[model samples]
Target: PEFAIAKFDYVGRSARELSFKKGASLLLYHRASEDWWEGRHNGIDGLVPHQYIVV
Candidate 1:
């Protein structure tokens, strides 16, 4: 099933990696790495941990 992207705010301005708040839905685009998966959220594309999302 497909999911929609929702608006969210970021507090970790110093954080190097991308961060998203809870309930932020994203579409799995590709296998970025062994531990991370590329995800697209409202046109914002980045890598997230596979453990954070479900297939």
Candidate 2:
């Protein structure tokens, strides 16, 4: 697992996505795609935008 910080506020578009505020810490699990990543926030696992997080 890897750790990252959110670079911007992201409101998930769907239930499978992860919503986070800017500067929030995230636990990265894996890359889901070129633009999306799998991570955990507040004990919930979901997909987040790659561009929104800084590793």
Candidate 3:
């Protein structure tokens, strides 16, 4: 199974990370060029999800 990753810009701002749960959808909006634009939500397609391990 292959997933795709989408990278988009909002006006001129970009996010470093996101706090999303498994099987979640993103419907975020940001201001860009005097208009509110929708953010490019990345689905579980490309790249790999980060994992945390504790000892």
Candidate 4:
């Protein structure tokens, strides 16, 4: 699959959620599970679910 860019604003659900917003570029760093993955968003590295990104 092609690399994906982050969708619109994503404030995350808790302090555990990765904080980011629209136009935040992301790159996969690890696969957390079937529904989650870890990545870096414009140097603010953290976790991002597949639903918040698009190729």
| Candidate maximizing TM-score | 2
Q: Considering summed lDDT, which 10 consecutive residues are worst modelled in model 2?
A: 29-38
TM-score rank order:
2, 4, 1, 3
lDDT of each: 0.58, 0.93, 0.31, 0.71
Candidate with the larger lDDT of 1 and 2: 2
The pairs that clash in candidate 1 are none
lDDT of 4 by residue, 1-55 (tens): 2355778777887655686777767777777887777777656666788777765
Q: Which one is best on lDDT?
A: 2
Runs in model 1 lying further than 4 Å from the true structure? 1-16
Worst 10 residues of 1 by lDDT: 8-17
lDDT, model 1: 0.58
Regions more than 4 Å wrong, model 4: 1-3
Tens-place lDDT per residue, model 3, 1-55, is: 1222323221222344443434444444442333233333454211122231001
lDDT over C-alpha atoms for residue 49 of model 2: 94
Each model's TM-score?
Answer: 0.54, 0.94, 0.21, 0.66
User: Candidate 4, after superposition: displacement of residue 30 in Å?
Assistant: 1.6
- Of models 2 and 4, which has the larger lDDT? 2
